[PDB]
Amino acid sequence: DIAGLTPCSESKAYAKLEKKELKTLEKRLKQYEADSAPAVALKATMERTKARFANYAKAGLLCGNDGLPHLIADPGLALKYGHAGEVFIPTFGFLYVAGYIGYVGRQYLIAVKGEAKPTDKEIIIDVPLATKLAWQGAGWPLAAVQELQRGTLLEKEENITVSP
Amino acid sequence: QAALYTHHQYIAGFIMCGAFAHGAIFFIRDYDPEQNKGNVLARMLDHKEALISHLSWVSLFLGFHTLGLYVHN
Amino acid sequence: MFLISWRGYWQELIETLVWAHEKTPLANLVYWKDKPVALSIVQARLVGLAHFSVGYIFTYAAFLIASTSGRF
Amino acid sequence: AHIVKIYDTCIGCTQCVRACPLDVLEMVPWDGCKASQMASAPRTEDCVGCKRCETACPTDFLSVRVYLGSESTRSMGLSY
Amino acid sequence: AWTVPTLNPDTPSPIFGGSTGGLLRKAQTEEFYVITWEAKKEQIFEMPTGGAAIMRQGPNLLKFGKKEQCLALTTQLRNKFKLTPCFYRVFPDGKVQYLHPADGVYPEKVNAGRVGANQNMRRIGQNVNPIKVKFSGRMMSPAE
Amino acid sequence: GDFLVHHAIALGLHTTTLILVKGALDARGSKLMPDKKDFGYSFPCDGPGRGGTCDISAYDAFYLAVFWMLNTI
Amino acid sequence: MKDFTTYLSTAPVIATIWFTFTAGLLIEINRYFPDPLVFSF
Amino acid sequence: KKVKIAVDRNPVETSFEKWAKPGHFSRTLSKGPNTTTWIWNLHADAHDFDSHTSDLEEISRKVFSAHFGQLGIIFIWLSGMYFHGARFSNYEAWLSDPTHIKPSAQVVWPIVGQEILNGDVGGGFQGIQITSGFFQLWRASGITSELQLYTTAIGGLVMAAAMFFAGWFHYHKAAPKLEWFQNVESMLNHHLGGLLGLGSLAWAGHQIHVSLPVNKLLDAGVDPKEIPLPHDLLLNRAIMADLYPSFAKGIAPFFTLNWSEYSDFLTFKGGLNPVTGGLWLSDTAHHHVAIAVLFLVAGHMYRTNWGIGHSMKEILEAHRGPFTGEGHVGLYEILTTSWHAQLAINLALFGSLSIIVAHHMYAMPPYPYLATDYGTQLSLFTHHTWIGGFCIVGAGAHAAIFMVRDYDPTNNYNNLLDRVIRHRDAIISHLNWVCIFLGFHSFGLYIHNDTMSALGRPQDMFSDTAIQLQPVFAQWIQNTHFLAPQLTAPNALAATSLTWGGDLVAVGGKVAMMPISLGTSDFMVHHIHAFTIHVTVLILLKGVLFARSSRLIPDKANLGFRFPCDGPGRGGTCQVSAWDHVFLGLFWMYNSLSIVIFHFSWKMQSDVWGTVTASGVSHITGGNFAQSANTINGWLRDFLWAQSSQVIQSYGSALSAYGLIFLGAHFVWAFSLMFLFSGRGYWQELIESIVWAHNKLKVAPAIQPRALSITQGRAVGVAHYLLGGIATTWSFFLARIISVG
Numbered sequence A: 001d002i003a004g005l006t007p008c009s010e011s012k013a014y015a016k017l018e019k020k021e022l023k024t025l026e027k028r029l030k031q032y033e034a035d036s037a038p039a040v041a042l043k044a045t046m047e048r049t050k051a052r053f054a055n056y057a058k059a060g061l062l063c064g065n066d067g068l069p070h071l072i073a074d075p076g077l078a079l080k081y082g083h084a085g086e087v088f089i090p091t092f093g094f095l096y097v098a099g100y101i102g103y104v105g106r107q108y109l110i111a112v113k114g115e116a117k118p119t120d121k122e123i124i125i126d127v128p129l130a131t132k133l134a135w136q137g138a139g140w141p142l143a144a145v146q147e148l149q150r151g152t153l154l155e156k157e158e159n160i161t162v163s164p
Numbered sequence B: 001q002a003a004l005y006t007h008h009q010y011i012a013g014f015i016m017c018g019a020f021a022h023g024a025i026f027f028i029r030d031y032d033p034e035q036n037k038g039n040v041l042a043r044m045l046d047h048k049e050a051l052i053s054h055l056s057w058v059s060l061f062l063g064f065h066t067l068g069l070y071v072h073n
Numbered sequence C: 001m002f003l004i005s006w007r008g009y010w011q012e013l014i015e016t017l018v019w020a021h022e023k024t025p026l027a028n029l030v031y032w033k034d035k036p037v038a039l040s041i042v043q044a045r046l047v048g049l050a051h052f053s054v055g056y057i058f059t060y061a062a063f064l065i066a067s068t069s070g071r072f
Numbered sequence D: 001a002h003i004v005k006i007y008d009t010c011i012g013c014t015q016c017v018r019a020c021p022l023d024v025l026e027m028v029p030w031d032g033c034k035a036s037q038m039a040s041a042p043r044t045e046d047c048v049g050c051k052r053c054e055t056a057c058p059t060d061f062l063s064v065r066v067y068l069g070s071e072s073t074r075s076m077g078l079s080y
Numbered sequence E: 001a002w003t004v005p006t007l008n009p010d011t012p013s014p015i016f017g018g019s020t021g022g023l024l025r026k027a028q029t030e031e032f033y034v035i036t037w038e039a040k041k042e043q044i045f046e047m048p049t050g051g052a053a054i055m056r057q058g059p060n061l062l063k064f065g066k067k068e069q070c071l072a073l074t075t076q077l078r079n080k081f082k083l084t085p086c087f088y089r090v091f092p093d094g095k096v097q098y099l100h101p102a103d104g105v106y107p108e109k110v111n112a113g114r115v116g117a118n119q120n121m122r123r124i125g126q127n128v129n130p131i132k133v134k135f136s137g138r139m140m141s142p143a144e
Numbered sequence F: 001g002d003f004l005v006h007h008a009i010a011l012g013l014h015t016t017t018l019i020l021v022k023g024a025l026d027a028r029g030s031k032l033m034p035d036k037k038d039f040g041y042s043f044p045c046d047g048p049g050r051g052g053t054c055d056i057s058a059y060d061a062f063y064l065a066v067f068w069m070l071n072t073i
Numbered sequence G: 001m002k003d004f005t006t007y008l009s010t011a012p013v014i015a016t017i018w019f020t021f022t023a024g025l026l027i028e029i030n031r032y033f034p035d036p037l038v039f040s041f
Numbered sequence H: 001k002k003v004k005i006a007v008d009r010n011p012v013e014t015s016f017e018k019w020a021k022p023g024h025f026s027r028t029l030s031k032g033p034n035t036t037t038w039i040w041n042l043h044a045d046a047h048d049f050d051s052h053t054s055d056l057e058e059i060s061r062k063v064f065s066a067h068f069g070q071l072g073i074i075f076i077w078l079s080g081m082y083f084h085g086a087r088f089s090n091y092e093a094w095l096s097d098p099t100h101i102k103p104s105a106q107v108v109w110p111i112v113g114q115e116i117l118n119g120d121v122g123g124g125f126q127g128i129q130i131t132s133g134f135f136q137l138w139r140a141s142g143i144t145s146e147l148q149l150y151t152t153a154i155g156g157l158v159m160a161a162a163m164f165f166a167g168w169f170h171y172h173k174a175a176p177k178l179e180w181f182q183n184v185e186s187m188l189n190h191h192l193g194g195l196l197g198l199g200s201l202a203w204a205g206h207q208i209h210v211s212l213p214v215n216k217l218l219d220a221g222v223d224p225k226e227i228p229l230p231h232d233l234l235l236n237r238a239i240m241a242d243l244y245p246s247f248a249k250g251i252a253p254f255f256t257l258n259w260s261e262y263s264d265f266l267t268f269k270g271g272l273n274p275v276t277g278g279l280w281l282s283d284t285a286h287h288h289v290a291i292a293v294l295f296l297v298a299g300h301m302y303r304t305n306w307g308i309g310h311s312m313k314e315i316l317e318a319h320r321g322p323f324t325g326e327g328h329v330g331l332y333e334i335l336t337t338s339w340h341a342q343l344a345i346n347l348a349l350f351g352s353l354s355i356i357v358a359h360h361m362y363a364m365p366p367y368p369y370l371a372t373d374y375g376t377q378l379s380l381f382t383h384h385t386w387i388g389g390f391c392i393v394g395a396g397a398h399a400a401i402f403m404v405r406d407y408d409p410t411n412n413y414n415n416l417l418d419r420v421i422r423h424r425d426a427i428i429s430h431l432n433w434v435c436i437f438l439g440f441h442s443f444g445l446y447i448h449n450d451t452m453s454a455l456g457r458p459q460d461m462f463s464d465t466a467i468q469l470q471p472v473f474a475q476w477i478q479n480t481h482f483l484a485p486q487l488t489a490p491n492a493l494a495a496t497s498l499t500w501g502g503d504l505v506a507v508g509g510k511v512a513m514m515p516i517s518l519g520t521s522d523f524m525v526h527h528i529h530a531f532t533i534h535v536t537v538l539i540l541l542k543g544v545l546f547a548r549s550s551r552l553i554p555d556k557a558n559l560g561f562r563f564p565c566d567g568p569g570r571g572g573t574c575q576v577s578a579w580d581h582v583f584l585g586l587f588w589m590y591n592s593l594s595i596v597i598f599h600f601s602w603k604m605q606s607d608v609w610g611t612v613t614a615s616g617v618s619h620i621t622g623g624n625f626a627q628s629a630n631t632i633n634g635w636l637r638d639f640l641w642a643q644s645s646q647v648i649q650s651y652g653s654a655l656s657a658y659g660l661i662f663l664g665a666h667f668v669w670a671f672s673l674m675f676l677f678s679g680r681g682y683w684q685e686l687i688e689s690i691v692w693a694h695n696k697l698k699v700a701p702a703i704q705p706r707a708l709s710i711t712q713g714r715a716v717g718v719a720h721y722l723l724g725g726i727a728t729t730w731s732f733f734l735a736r737i738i739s740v741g
């Protein structure tokens, strides 16, 4: 109960929706022989379904009046009430990989600018240079702040403009 | 209530796009750089690429993640 | 039609219509004062945007008024 | 009629005249480039404004420049 | 040597069965444009109005409604056939006007004596702002 | 749903201002057409040259913003 | 086969190998770790 | 020998060295990128072989081996459909009950919840219900086991490898010379004789010896593992004489010309098999026998190496009259020296074939248990009409490519083509008139019915209970084709289809086919079709005839087939090329064929399809086509709104992917309107403003970002428009008809 909400292990619409999905799977299962190949896949779907409900109720997700889990996207209401794995932990688990790709592509461009003709190594990617920059880009925030402290991250007004 | 809200919201949308339309007519017909040496109206054109690129970033982020969460649901 | 089709298809169509009018018997008597050309490029934009906006507003106005005042 | 002006960035490579579908343009003696020649627009009454001249100009920020003006029966390109 | 040739309609037309792309009432009321060329041999050329005609040996005369049709015909006669055509301008009151090679020399070659109209002795980035040309009577470009 | 649609509204507002601010600031010129102020506010194009210049004017950037405006409203 | 390895290093071939790699990594993850809505432990 | 094999040994060395160099085919693209337009020109100019080189021999070699590439891909595709029919299907179950078991041949992997798409298709099986009709083909061929499907899938892989090896051989190792390809008389004799004639003779052999006895034992009612295998039907004449008692006489009635004794298994029944709702396979057997004899006669027409036969140049140059000048002179030399002129005619007649196939496979359903599978019927009609309409627009495109590139005024003086160019204004003006006439007198009838139904005046409408517009001519043709077994085809036991009149064939409680009444709404929709087909002809033929010149641009052929414009001048010249005309004709082919497939999907659901109880048969939509398709609001309510009520609530079921694509193709379609409405000079300046941001953070690419080309953005817009509209209608149709059909 952060903003009119309720834990999903407490709310009854969540359990009613679990029983609704298991009821649809059960009346779907009632047509087949108990050991046939469709019935095995239907019971495996039931097992994945029940494991999904158990692990959404276990992590302390907040349900609403609809019986559906919600995501508190504010630190200080996620850190204080234990919901940092909703948004606040994957908002850095994403940005590590985002700045990773943005650093690997940056360094692949800068390490191919100073050649004979760079464009041929942009349609035909130099794979050993690409995999070297793929592995050694693991510490990208480190190298990014060390590049920002120089001023070698930005370029000055050598850039191309029109008519200011 | 539905008619009045939708009425004044489309009136406001057309008037707000025409605000920028006549703001674009200003820079062609009325703007003088030698009369506007260094003011806010010239610094606006000076970093116009930063303005358009940051609006492009905000729009591209909002569309990527709004459409992504809707298609996900 | 004003948005996807652009002017130059239509000028080539209007030239064949000018041919058909200026070679038809007894319609040669009737002649224009303004030479028929297709709508210009900026004009094609404005006409397509005008029909787009008028159809947009009339569709949603009919839907809004009927959808609210039908059940209420 | 359309406004066809040229500018002194002309290198005299006479490509606008060959690109012109209406003989608006022609090459005039001049002493501002190596080719000793510059274009001219004496016949802008016949111009339609199709801008083939400034698809063919090699100089960065084109030396020929067509400004779409009033439209007569020759500027609209009419056989009728 | 060369001084402004004249025209007679006595010169034949190339053999052409007639298309629907020919002249209109603009030819009879406003103007129509005639083209002449001397051909060396009888050969087939594409009409700018659609269709193929065969030109005959000697002088030819063919009439169009646009200057672009006549200059397109000169463009394919000078390139594919290496001929030297010239087209004129005929008004319905019989007044004829020499239009193509004014000085005899084709316009992509310097004749040393034609005058440079519509030239700006300045760079195109050095145009004034439109605020400086405002209220010039009519609406006006900064290139003037 | 109101989270998602307020971010849809923010997408629409930022994209409509992207089109309108880009039309107002590039109204005087761009790298594709450095003398756009010489042609005025409303003009078709600058021809097929330089890659093609369909919808290059500031009028034609108001124009594309009316669609995103009607979308937003 | 040096020319074959330069063909293998072109843009669409690297694109269709790397996208199958990053597809069939996330697909094996969502097989062995079903339904990750929230960062658990 | 004038007609002889003539090749060149080892013309092109097989090496991966040119795979390393993209753009090797083009003189301009071989220098590499400097600009992102390069990589779109790489894929756009990839198969335009006529612009790579000028040697017609090299062009013909490239297009002859590219056809082996397409054939290898089709054999991979067919072999995959046989393999997915073998290993992932309920076809074994479907053969025992082909009325309550849905045909399924695609199973998904249970990962992200997509295993809900493995629906309960029946027969102890879960998968996606297919609608491509392969199971009805396989029953009509006499398959009866997934072993035969697996082995013909292996044969399809072998034949795909044969096709790929063949293209490699006939391009790299032993490639044919130019005057090999120019033997069109030999190509027509071999294709009418060997492809069409011997192929239908061979399918006649398979139908006589394999599919007639197997399907007769199926229709009598025998388990498929109890049926003799077809090699036991070849070897044992006693089983075939038990099934058809004239196999005891052998091939003696064929050579004594006592062919009437073969009337046990070559029939002229007509109508439908009432056991299964398909055509009689004895009737299709005699069909392919007669087709085989006809095309083997037709393939001995043209002169190749002996003095007998016709030569097509002498056929063309003889057919000339007083009205048409020199007649067909010169058409042989342009249909032998131009591949685009061939591809125009072939795409035209082949896309007409697809539509004739689509109309001839609903009314005369040729497969067992095809007609009561309503989903297969709807998807086959829709599929083949779309393939036909695309091929007709490609005909209109490649005719104009011939006009721009390969047309020569020297070879064409006062023939048919020159005289058509010289009255193109009359052609396009009269077609403009008839399009405007058809538009008013077809769509204004719908606007009139809208207005009268809205103004409270239903008596003043155009309907059956109002001002009637009866299709007297089509009704008269229906009467004559229903009375054709009386005196104009006296050896027909029934009419050639059930649409002409009579009773209904009912299979499994569902109507296979019943007679189709043609009323006022049928009149109005057939004139909507005539209108939209004439407008598509107007646009495509205006692009062909004005491909080289017009009064607007007299030198359009120097600008090319695919050019954006000739600038803003002379009023504006946007979209003046022939490419832009086939661009605009693609929208009208979409417009026409969407109404064609809507008229099918609502005429069949209203007046043909539905369950029968032998108690006054109740159709699917209750019989509201003639009663409610008078108005645009009737097509809105009772067709789009009413029948979208199964694609919109398909979530949480096996049809839910159709619920997703119906949204997604609503996306892509509207996404196309970003490309169709906007223009390049916007996006190039937006790319400048973000190239600045990539310059500021040192991440500007060396291949410089450009906006899409004008005729590229038009191509992207029309491609996304067609995809998003056709896939919307795809998902709508299939989610409707799998559920309620």
Ligand code: CLA
Residues within 6 Å of the ligand: B014, B015, B016, B017, B018, B019, B021, B022, B025, C050, C054, F041, F042, F059, F062
């Ligand atoms: C206080 C309000 C106001 C004022 C005084 C002006 C004044 C001006 N504007 Mg501006 N403008 C405004 C609001 C305003 N605008 C708004 C709100 C918008 C956004 C829609 C615009 C968008 C705009 C553009 C894009 C342009 C102008 C231009 C102009 C100038 C010329 C006017 C003109 O072309 O008239 C003539 C106007 C018309 C003939 C209007 C066309 C008809 C429209 C499309 C309505 C059609 C709807 C239809 C009738 C509905 C019927 C339905 C049917 C079924 C019954 C003038 C200085 C132009 C300019 O300066 O040129 C350089 C120019 O290019 N304005």
Ligand code: CLA
Residues within 6 Å of the ligand: B056, B057, B059, B060, B061, B062, B063, B064, B067, F011, F015, F018, F019, F064, F065, F067, F068, H667, H670, H671, H672, H673, H674, H675, H677, H678, H682, H686
């Ligand atoms: C449904 C139609 C539609 C859609 C989706 C868009 C989308 C967009 N427009 Mg708009 N636009 C439209 C119609 C549409 N427009 C119309 C009708 C017009 C009038 C011509 C315009 C005029 C217009 C202008 C003038 C501008 C935009 C801009 C934008 C962008 C805004 C940034 C954003 O939201 O990025 C989010 C991206 C998306 C929502 C689409 C991406 C879809 C997915 C995520 C991509 C990947 C899917 C998948 C992997 C691909 C597989 C393909 C294949 C392999 C099978 C975005 C690309 C602006 C822009 O460029 O901003 C930078 C801009 O300046 N548009």
Ligand code: CLA
Residues within 6 Å of the ligand: H063, H064, H067, H068, H071, H180, H181, H183, H184, H186, H187, H190, H191, H193, H194, H195
């Ligand atoms: C009776 C002989 C015969 C037969 C059956 C064919 C059959 C075919 N020809 Mg063809 N052709 C022939 C003689 C023959 N040709 C002659 C004599 C010439 C020279 C004048 C040509 C010149 C020619 C050209 C230029 C082209 C064709 C093409 C085609 C294919 C059309 C596509 C189709 O319907 O796929 C139907 C598919 C099948 C029938 C699958 C069965 C495949 C069989 C086994 C191969 C075809 C029979 C083959 C000719 C026998 C030779 C065996 C080989 C070992 C020598 C088709 C396979 C086109 C094509 O697609 O090329 C690949 C094409 O571009 N033909």
Ligand code: CLA
Residues within 6 Å of the ligand: C001, C004, C005, H432, H435, H436, H437, H438, H439, H440, H443, H444, H447, H535, H538, H539, H584, H587, H588
């Ligand atoms: C619903 C949208 C719509 C409509 C009505 C039209 C209408 C038309 N298109 Mg068109 N088009 C459209 C969308 C549309 N288009 C789109 C989206 C594209 C994009 C690719 C095109 C591309 C296109 C091309 C490329 C061509 C056409 C052509 C035509 C004309 C053929 C029909 C005709 O003459 O019949 C008569 C007119 C109608 C059926 C329109 C409705 C009139 C109703 C029935 C009655 C009249 C109203 C009544 C008198 C009341 C008047 C009230 C008073 C106050 C004025 C017509 C002007 C063709 C053409 O002009 O040549 C013939 C042509 O070549 N269009």
Ligand SMILES: CC1=C(/C=C/C(C)=C/C=C/C(C)=C/C=C/C=C(C)/C=C/C=C(C)/C=C/C2=C(C)CCCC2(C)C)C(C)(C)CCC1
Residues within 6 Å of the ligand: B019, B020, B021, B022, B023, B024, B026, F021, F024
């Ligand atoms: C929190 C709050 C508050 C506050 C509020 C505020 C502060 C607001 C503000 C707001 C704002 C602050 C707004 C603004 C807006 C703006 C706008 C809307 C603008 C626009 C612009 C434009 C449109 C432009 C135009 C132009 C151009 C284009 C360029 C140049 C020229 C011109 C200028 C014309 C209070 C406490 C009171 C209360 C409670 C709540």
Ligand SMILES: CC1=C(/C=C/C(C)=C\C=C\C(C)=C\C=C\C=C(C)/C=C/C=C(C)/C=C/C2=C(C)CCCC2(C)C)C(C)(C)CCC1
Residues within 6 Å of the ligand: B064, B067, B068, B071, H661, H663, H664, H665, H667, H668, H723, H726, H727, H730
């Ligand atoms: C994951 C991802 C994402 C997202 C994405 C999205 C958002 C998408 C969407 C999309 C949409 C929003 C829509 C779509 C749609 C699609 C479609 C729609 C497709 C289609 C295809 C096809 C292939 C088709 C086919 C067909 C049919 C079915 C019909 C007719 C026939 C044919 C064959 C043509 C992100 C960015 C986050 C990141 C990266 C990745």
Ligand SMILES: CC1=C(C/C=C(\C)CCC[C@H](C)CCC[C@H](C)CCCC(C)C)C(=O)c2ccccc2C1=O
Residues within 6 Å of the ligand: G015, H674, H675, H676, H678, H679, H680, H683, H684, H706, H707, H708, H709, H710, H712, H713, H714
């Ligand atoms: C949006 C739009 C553009 C902009 C579209 C740009 C130019 C292309 C869109 C991006 C393409 C898809 C390239 C992005 C993918 C690259 C290949 C990089 C791939 C990186 C990884 C995914 C491998 C136009 O250029 C245009 C031109 C004419 C009329 C309308 C429009 C138009 O509407």
Ligand code: SF4
Residues within 6 Å of the ligand: D009, D010, D011, D012, D013, D014, D015, D016, D017, D038, D039, D056, D057, D058, D059, D063, D064
């Ligand atoms: S403009 Fe370009 S082409 Fe015309 S003259 Fe100057 S340089 Fe030669």
Ligand code: SF4
Residues within 6 Å of the ligand: C006, C041, F044, F045, F046, F047, F048, F052, F053, F054, F055, H564, H565, H566, H567, H568, H572, H573, H574, H575, H710
């Ligand atoms: S194509 Fe570009 S340039 Fe040519 S006319 Fe259309 S808009 Fe103007």
